[PDB]
Write a protein that binds this ligand. Sequence first.
Ligand SMILES: O=c1ccn([C@@H]2O[C@H](COP(=O)(O)OP(=O)(O)O)[C@@H](O)[C@H]2O)c(=O)[nH]1
Ligand SMILES: O=c1ccn([C@@H]2O[C@H](COP(=O)(O)OP(=O)(O)O)[C@@H](O)[C@H]2O)c(=O)[nH]1
Ligand SMILES: O=c1ccn([C@@H]2O[C@H](COP(=O)(O)OP(=O)(O)O)[C@@H](O)[C@H]2O)c(=O)[nH]1
Ligand SMILES: O=c1ccn([C@@H]2O[C@H](COP(=O)(O)OP(=O)(O)O)[C@@H](O)[C@H]2O)c(=O)[nH]1
Lengths: 443, 439, 443, 436
Amino acid sequence: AHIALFPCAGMGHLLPFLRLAAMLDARGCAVTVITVKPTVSAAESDHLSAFFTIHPRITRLEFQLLPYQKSGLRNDDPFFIQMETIATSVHLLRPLLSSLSPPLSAIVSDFTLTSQVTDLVSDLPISTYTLMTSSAAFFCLMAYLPKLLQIDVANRDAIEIPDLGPISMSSIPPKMLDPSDFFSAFISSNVSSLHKVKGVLINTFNSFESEAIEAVRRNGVDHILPIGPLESYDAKKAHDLPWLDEQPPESVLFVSFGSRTALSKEQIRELGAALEKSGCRFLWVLKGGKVDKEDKEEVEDMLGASFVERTKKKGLIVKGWVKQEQILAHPAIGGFVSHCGWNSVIEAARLGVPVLAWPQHGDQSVNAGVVEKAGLGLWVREWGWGQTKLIGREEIAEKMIEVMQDEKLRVSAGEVRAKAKETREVDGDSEALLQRLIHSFNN
Amino acid sequence: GAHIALFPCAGMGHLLPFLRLAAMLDARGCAVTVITVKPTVSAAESDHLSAFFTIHPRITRLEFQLLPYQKSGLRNDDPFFIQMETIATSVHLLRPLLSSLSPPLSAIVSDFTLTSQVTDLVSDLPISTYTLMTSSAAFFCLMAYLPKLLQIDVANRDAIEIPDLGPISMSSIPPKMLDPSDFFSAFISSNVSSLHKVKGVLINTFNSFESEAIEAVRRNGVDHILPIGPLESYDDLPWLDEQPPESVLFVSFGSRTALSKEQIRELGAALEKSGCRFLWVLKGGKVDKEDKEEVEDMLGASFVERTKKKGLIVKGWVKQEQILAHPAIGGFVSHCGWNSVIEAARLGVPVLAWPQHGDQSVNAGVVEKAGLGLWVREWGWGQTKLIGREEIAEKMIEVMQDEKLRVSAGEVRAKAKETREVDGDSEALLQRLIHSFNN
Amino acid sequence: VGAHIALFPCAGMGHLLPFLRLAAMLDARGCAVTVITVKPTVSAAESDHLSAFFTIHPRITRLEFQLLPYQKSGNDDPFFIQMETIATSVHLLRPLLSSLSPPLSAIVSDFTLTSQVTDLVSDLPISTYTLMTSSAAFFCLMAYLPKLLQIDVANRDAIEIPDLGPISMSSIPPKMLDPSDFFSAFISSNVSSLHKVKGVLINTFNSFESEAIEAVRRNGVDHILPIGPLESYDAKKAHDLPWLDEQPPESVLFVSFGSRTALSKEQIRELGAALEKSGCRFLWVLKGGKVDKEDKEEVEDMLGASFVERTKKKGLIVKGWVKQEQILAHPAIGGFVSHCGWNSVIEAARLGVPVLAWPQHGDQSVNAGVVEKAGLGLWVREWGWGQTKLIGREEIAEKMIEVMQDEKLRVSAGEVRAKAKETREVDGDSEALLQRLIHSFNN
Amino acid sequence: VGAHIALFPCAGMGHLLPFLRLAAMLDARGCAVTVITVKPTVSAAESDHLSAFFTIHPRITRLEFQLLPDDPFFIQMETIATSVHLLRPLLSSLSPLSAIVSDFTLTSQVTDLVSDLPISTYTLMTSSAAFFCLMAYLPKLLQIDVANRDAIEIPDLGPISMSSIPPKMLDPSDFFSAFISSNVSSLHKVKGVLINTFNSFESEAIEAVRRNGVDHILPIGPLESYDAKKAHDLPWLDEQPPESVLFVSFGSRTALSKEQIRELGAALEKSGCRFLWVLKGGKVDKEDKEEVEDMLGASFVERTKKKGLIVKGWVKQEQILAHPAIGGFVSHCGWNSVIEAARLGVPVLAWPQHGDQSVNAGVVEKAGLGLWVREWGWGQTKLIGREEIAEKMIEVMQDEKLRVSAGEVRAKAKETREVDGDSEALLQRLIHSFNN
Ligand SMILES: O=c1ccn([C@@H]2O[C@H](COP(=O)(O)OP(=O)(O)O)[C@@H](O)[C@H]2O)c(=O)[nH]1
Ligand SMILES: O=c1ccn([C@@H]2O[C@H](COP(=O)(O)OP(=O)(O)O)[C@@H](O)[C@H]2O)c(=O)[nH]1
Ligand SMILES: O=c1ccn([C@@H]2O[C@H](COP(=O)(O)OP(=O)(O)O)[C@@H](O)[C@H]2O)c(=O)[nH]1
Ligand SMILES: O=c1ccn([C@@H]2O[C@H](COP(=O)(O)OP(=O)(O)O)[C@@H](O)[C@H]2O)c(=O)[nH]1
C-alpha cells in the first residue's frame, strides 16, 4: 500500500494534509506527499522543509506547476488563484505517477484538485480519495449548491438543507451563488466528480457534527469518513512561549484570523480599541499586510508606538507566524477569536478553548454556526460579514468580555474537548474509522 | 455599442452557430452576453463553452441551472431533443436575472426551439427579440408551412408543394415531423406560430446560396428573414500534412448522430474498395461523447492494420473547420447537417451527401442543387435503411473524380467569400442589424 | 458482454436484493448491465448494499434517479410511499435512458411501477420485463385480485384462483380484500400493465411450484418464466461467526425475521424463552426497528439482561444486518426460523436448510403454505397474523424440538436442495430460460 | 502616504518616461507607488531607464510581468495584451491598490481585470489634446465618411488637415485603427483620464474632449522630471554662453534618411548655431542600432569639432534643455518632448517625422512656442534643401518675438504647476478621492 497526498495552496489546505500524512505514516502506510513550486506563501515552503526533515520516510514529490493560464473564474484572491494554477497542471503528472518506483495504491486528493486528479488516475490502478478541509455542515451546503442554484430565484431568508436545520441566506457567501467566480465553479466541478472517489475524508468527529455527518450520508455522499480531529506533527524549534508563562491561566484572550485573512484599516484600529477597553489580557496575531506573508513586509506601523506602550502590561502583539496549536494548548489562553476556518475551529474544540466567532469570507459563517451549536463559542449573527462590515469598539469589547466570563461556555467547551479525545481513542469512532480505512488501503 | 444576449439550445449544431455569431457581434463592437445552462448534455458543449470564454474575455457568459425534465404530451427519445424541452421550461427563470444585467439589454437573439418561450419572457420587458435558425432556408420554408400541413391528409402524396418554391418530395420529409405528438413536429410547429413576435429571424445562409428559397420564405409570412451566412469561426493535422492535396476523403456525421453497427461495417469495406486516402471520424457511441466509451472495437483489429497506409480513423472530437480548410481533403461525406454544409461551402469542399435523419434530406438537396455536392435519392434515409459497400464505393470515387464538381464548389466558395466582403450583402446585413440596436 | 440490460428495483431489501442478483446473473451470462436506483433510499441498508454491489461487481454501471418532492395523503408504509414517490419521478428515467451508450435491449422494472413506465417503453421502444419477488402461489392471488374483486367483495372460507389449491382467507392479507384501500388499486393496475411486458420472471422453479406455474400460465400470464433460485452476490468479510466455527455441524438454529422487525416485543420474549427451553444452539439476527434501519436505536432493551446472560455460552445475537445467505450456507447451521419472506424461502430450499415457519404479514402466510407443501419446513397455521395472537413459550418450544429431531424433514429438505441445484445446472430448466432470454435480446 | 498606487506602461519611452514621472509625482503627493513593467523590454534604453528609476527612488516598488511567446513597439504592445492575465496574480499578492493608472494601448484588455479585483483605474495619455480627440473622434468618423478629404473636423475643434493625419490611422483594415478605436470604447470604464497638457496650452482642445464625452479627462501637464543628480557631463555645455546652443533630438527612435539627415548637417554649419546633437542610428530600436557617425561623414566632424558636439545614443533631455546654454530646440515633436520644451521655455523648431507629431507641430504653431514649416511633411517623403533649412534655422536664433512668446509659455506652464493652478489642484484632488 502506497498512499499519496495532494494538498492545494494555503496553510489551511497544506496543514491538514501533512497532519494526516504523518498520521498515516505512524500507522504504517508508505506515504508520499505531493508538493508543487512555487508556493504562494513563505510559510508553506518553510513548513514543508521542516516537515520532511522531521518525517524522513515520507517521500516528497515536487513538480513545478505551469505558468498561470486562464479564461473565466473571476478570482481576486492569491491562494484561490494558485489553486486554479495547480488544477490546470494536474493532468501533466500522469506520466510521472505511472513510473514511480513504489507504485501508489491510492491518492488522497484535495477537494479542489479532485476533478482533475480523478481523470488523472482513470486508467491507472490507483484508488481516488478526497480529504475535506472544511466542516461537514459546509459539505451539506456544497452538495445542495446545484439545487440551491436552480431553485434560488428569490432573495428571501434561508434555504432548508434537506436533513438538518435551514441555513440563513446571510451565511451563504455571495461568491458561491455567482457561477462566474472561481469559488462556485470549483465547488460545483468537484462535487460532480466526488462519485468517482472511493471515500471522502472529513476533519470532524461523529460527536461534533452528528446531524451534518448523517445528513450527507443520506444525501448521496454515502462514502463520508470522519477522521477528525487531526493530530499535530509536533515538529517545532522556535519558542515564542515565554510571555504566556508569565500569564495567569485563562486570563489571556487569543485573537487570530488564519493564514491569509486581514482586517480593514478601520477594523484593525477598532479591534485594538476594543482590546484596550475590555481590560482583558490578550495575544494578538497581526496580519495587516494581507494574505501573502512575503508581501506583508510591514512591521507594526499599523497601530503606532503609543498603543504598544498602553497595552504592554496586558498584551503581546505578534506579527508573523505563531505556533497556534501550541498557544491554544497553553494554560494561559482561555479565549479564542476566530474567523472560524475549520482547522482553527477543530483545534479550539480539541483543546477546549471558548471561541468568539467572527467570519470574514466563505464557509466561515456556517462553521461559525457549528461552533455556536456545539457550545464551543459565542456567535453574533448581526455582525454579519467581516470585510463587508465594521464593528465598533463598544460592540467588540462587550463580546470580548462576555466570552471570557461565560462559565457555561468554559464548561460547555470542555465537554466538546472530552468528546474529541474519545474519538481518537481506539474505541472512539474517528481512530477506529481510520484504522478501518488503513486496512482497506492494503490491496 | 449595445447589449445583446444570445441564448442557444441543446447540442453542438445549435451551440457552435450561436458562439460564432456572439464572437461576430463582439468583433463589430457589440457588447455581448451568452446565456448558457447547466448541466450540459455533452462533454463537447461544456468544453467548448469554457474555451470560448477564455478566448473572448470581453464577452460575458451567463449560467443557468436546469430544472428537471417535465411531463408533457410530446414524444421524445433523443437526448439532445429532450434537453431542448428542458431548457424551454426553464426560460422563465430568466426574468429576475435580466432586470439586473450590468448594461441594460438592447435585444436578445434566441434559438428557434427557444423562441416561443423567450418571446413571452420579454413581451412586457422593452427588449427586441431576434432568433437565429440553425437549418437551411429550404427546410425553413417547409417549417413555416407545417401548421397548414398538419391539418391536411397528405397521404399517398409522393410530393407536397411548398408555397413559393418547388414541392419537396415526401421522401425527404421526416415522418416524425408530420406526427403531431412527436417533439420534433411540435416544437417546429409551436415556434413558427410565435415567429411574428420576433423583430427578425437570422438564418445562417447567403443570398447566392439560397436565393430562391429566401424569397420564397419572405412572401409567406416570415418577412423578417436576415441571411448573414456564413458564420465565421470564433477560433489530427500531422497525418494530414503528409498527404497529397485533394487525395483525402473525409467522413463525418456531425456531433449528435451515429451509424448502425451493420451499416458501419459496410462503410469501412467501401472505403477499402474505394482506395481513397481517407480520414474517418467514427462515432459508435450513439450521440453522447460521455457515454460513447467504445474505442475502435467497431472495426476490428485486422481492419485498421490493412488500412493504415491509405487511412486514418479516429473516435473523438475532430476539429472540423481545420480539417476542411487543409489542402489535402478532396471530398466530404456528410449527413448534410446545415452547419457542416455551410462550412463545406465556405471552403469549397465537394460533398457527397448522405442524409441520415431529420432536416438533413432537404438540406441534402440544396447541396446538390447548388452544385456543392452530389446526393443520391435512392439511398434515402440513413438510420432507416442500409446501403452496400459496393454502391457506396462507386459514389465515393466519383466525387473525387469529378473536376466539374470541384469547379462548382469553388464558385460556391467565392460567393461565400463575397458576402463576407464589406460590399457583400451578408456582411452588410449584419452591420445594418447592428446599427438598429438602440441604447 | 454485448447486450445492454438495465434492471430497476424501487424500494425495500426484498425488492432490491433479488434484482441485484438478477443483474449479476445477467452479466455472468453476457449482458452488459446498468442498475437503476432511486435516492434518497428509505433505509441505510439498501445504500449499504448498493455501494458494495458496485464496488464488488465493477463492470455493472449504476444509474441513479434523484426523487422529487412528494406530499400525497391517504402514514401507510414508508416503502409504499417510496414506491409511489419513485412513480412520481419515473419520467426522470427519460433523459437518462436516451443518453445511455449501448442503448437498452431490454429493461427489467419492479412490478410496483409497471403502469408508470408503460408510456416510457412506448416512446423509447424498450422491450420491458419484470421480476416478481413473491411466491408463485401468492403471485397467482395477486394476478386474480382484479377479477375476484369485481364480484361480491367479501370473505369466505377459501377464495379460489383458477387452476391451483384454493387459498384460505387467513393466509390473505385483509387490506387486499377491500377495494377502497391503497393496496388493491396498485395491484389491480399493475396486473393490467403485464400485457405490455415481454416476459415476467419469478423467483421460483417448477418442482417447488408445479401448479402455480401452470395456474399462472393458463390464467393470463403466458410469458411467465421461473428462473429460480436466484444466485448469490459477493460481499467480502466474515468476523460474524467466531462462535459459528466453535459450534458443531448442523447444530445451530438461525433465527431471522427478515429485513424488518416482525413480532411485538412481548411475543418475541416468549420465543426467547422458547429458544431456551429447546436447547437449540442459535445465531439470531434481531431487527429492533420494525421498518427502518435508520430508526432502530434500541439494543439489549428488546429481550432484557435476564435472557442474554443465560444463553451466553449457547447462542449469539446480532442486532441489525447480517449476511444471511453466507450464514445459512455454513456447515454449522441446521435449522431456519423464518418470517417466510419469499426471498428467504428460496435460499433455504437452495441451501437445503430446514424451516420453522412463522409468517408475520402479507404474502408470508401463503409462503408458509408453500413451505409446507414442498416439505421444506414445519408450519403452524394457527399462529396467525403477527401480533394477532400471543403464542406461549411452551408451544413454541415443542415445534422447535420437533424441527431438530424430525428426520423425514431433513430427508425431504435435503431432496429439495438437490432439485434446486438441478435447475441451476446448465441443462437445467430455470437455467435454460435465463440463457434463452439473453439469446433473444438484440444489439 | 496612505494611498497605494501602481502604473503600467507597455512600451516606448514615449509612454514609460511620462508614466515614471507620474509615479514620482504620485510619491511626492503621498502615494505608495508600484510600477509595473513588461519583460523582456523591447529596448535596452527602456530597460536602462527603469533600473535607474528604482535605484534613484528607493521607496517606489517595482513589479514585473514576464512575457509569454509590423512595428516592434506596436507588436509588443500587442504582446502585453496577451499576457495581461499575468497581472492577476500580481494584484492578488500586493501588500490592495487604491487605484491603477494604465497605458491607453491596453485599456481594453484590463477591463475584465478591473471588474474582478475591484480597482478604480485611470489612464494617462502621452499625446496632445488635439491628437487625442482625433483618436477620440476617430471611431465615429471612420464608419460615417469612409473617404479622403483635405481637412477633417472634430466637433468643437478647428479642423486639422488630412496632411497632418497619419495614413495608417486612416485605413480601416489596419491594425492601428482597431487598437485606437477599441480602446476609446474601453475609455468608458476609467474613473479618470490624464494627458500631459495644461488647459492654457490647449483650451480649445481640452474642451472638445470634455464636450465629446471624454468628460473625465484631467490635464496634469507639465509632468515633473524624475531625475539623477549630479553628473559632471557636458563640460562642453557649461563653457558656452547662455542660449548659444542648439540641441537636436529627432526622437527615442531614428526619424530621417542619411541623405536627408546630411542636408540638416550641412544646414547646421551654414546656420552657425552651436549645437549638441542627439543622433540615434536605429530607426526604432536602440539594441538594433549599431552604426557609428558615418551617416554625416568624417569631414563634418573635423570641420565642426569646436563648434558642436554629437552624442550617439541617449542623453538626458530635460537635463540638457534646462541648461542656460540651450537656446534652441529642434524636435521631431513627440509630445513628451514638446511639453518639455514649453515647461523649460526653450524655443523650438518643428520637424515631425511621423505619426501624431505633425499635429503636435500644429499645436506648437498655435502656441507660438516654435517655428514650423508644414510643407516639409512626413519624413523621407521629400527632400528638403540645406539652403532652405538654414534660413529657418537662423530665424529661430534671431527672432525676438519668439523669445517673448516662449517666455510667456514657460510662465503659463508654471502657473498650472503651482498650487493654485488646476493641474496641481486636480492631482491633489484625485489623490484625495483615492480611498484606502
Ligand atoms: O499565525 C498562524 C496562523 C495560522 N496557523 C495555523 O493555520 C491553521 C489553519 O488555519 P485555518 O484553516 O483556521 O484558517 P485559514 O488560514 O484556512 O483561513 C491553523 O490550525 C493554525 O494552527 C498558525 O499556526 N499560525
Ligand atoms: O467532430 C466534429 C463534429 C462536429 N463538428 C462541428 O459541429 C458543428 C455542428 O454540426 P451539424 O449541426 O451540421 O450536425 P449536427 O451536430 O447538428 O448533427 C459543425 O460546424 C461541425 O463543423 C466538428 O467540428 N467536429
Ligand atoms: O438480515 C438479513 C435479512 C435479509 N437478508 C436477505 O435480504 C432479503 C430480505 O428477505 P425477504 O425479502 O424474503 O423478507 P422481507 O424483505 O419481505 O422482510 C432476503 O433475500 C435475505 O436473503 C439478509 O441478507 N440479511
Ligand atoms: O535622447 C533622448 C530622446 C528622447 N528623450 C525623452 O523622450 C521622451 C518622450 O519622447 P516623445 O514621446 O516626445 O517622442 P517619441 O518617444 O514618440 O519618439 C521625452 O520625455 C524625452 O525627454 C530623452 O530623454 N532622450
